[PDB]
């Protein structure tokens, strides 16, 4: 056995998947995704480190 202990990551393989989805009070524009980056500066409490 190699020196670094092996770890097993059991689950599913998905490209970009955010499982924690709740309701956010503040919302942004519907179509303009160029201003959706503002909510990644002050994120909701549950999506601070997804």
């Amino acid at each position: 056995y190699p020196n670094p202990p092996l770890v097993i990551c059991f689950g599913a393989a998905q490209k970009e998947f955010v499982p924690t989805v709740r309701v956010s009070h503040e919302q942004m524009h519907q179509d303009k995704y160029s201003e959706w980056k503002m909510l990644q500066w002050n994120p909701p409490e549950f999506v601070r480190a997804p």
Binding site: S34, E35, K37, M38
Partner: protein, 58 residues
């Protein structure tokens, strides 16, 4: 509201300036136009800022 999340356009200043002009300055200047009252026996009129129509260039 634009420009708070990305870099604004380099021609937005003159764009909004010309828009503000063609929106309010023409009417503001036509309002201060004086009224000429003469030609009693003749048919004339004054400057009424009610139509205010600009036609597209041919």
């Amino acid at each position: 509201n634009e420009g708070i999340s990305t870099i604004p356009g380099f021609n937005q200043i003159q764009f909004e300036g010309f828009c503000r002009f063609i929106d309010q300055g023409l009417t503001e200047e036509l309002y201060k136009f004086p009224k000429i009252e003469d030609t009693d026996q003749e048919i004339e009129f004054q400057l009424f800022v009610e139509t205010y129509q600009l036609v597209e260039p041919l």
